[PDB]
């Protein structure tokens, strides 16, 4: 269990650590570490919420719905914070690319690969510190989305997270 601090993810926001800077999160008010599901699964309009029961609110896609965190293209610091920390795989990263559309479902084919960084099977510290690349042909509002494999079962920790790039 566990979430992105920063830049702040969808459901973290939703939380009073998060600022309440999302309303309407649903389980994210209060847990927002606990978006699991199997690995790979990627459901068109379902990606914020993994499909998980009680996380649908984050589902809402508009191009205003969701308090973004202002970035640059380029290196950019991601902080995860473990709630329980699980033996781990893998962290994946994707990001939608130019010219997705904001007023539309989420759909993994939209997004590109950003970073891939291997859990090597073991138990991460409770704050996990990694840099991505942003690349340059993004620019305003896009979606980050994370994906923190675990080594030990099937599942997976999924965070979209809202940025605008300038
Ligand atoms: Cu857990």
Redesign the pocket.
Known sequence: ??YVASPGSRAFFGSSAGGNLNTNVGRAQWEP?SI?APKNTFITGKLASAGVSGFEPLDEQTATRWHKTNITTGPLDITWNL??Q?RTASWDYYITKNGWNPNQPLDIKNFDKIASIDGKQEVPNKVVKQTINIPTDRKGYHVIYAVWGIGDTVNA?YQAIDVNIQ
């Open positions: 269990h566990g570490q699991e709630t329980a699980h920790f």
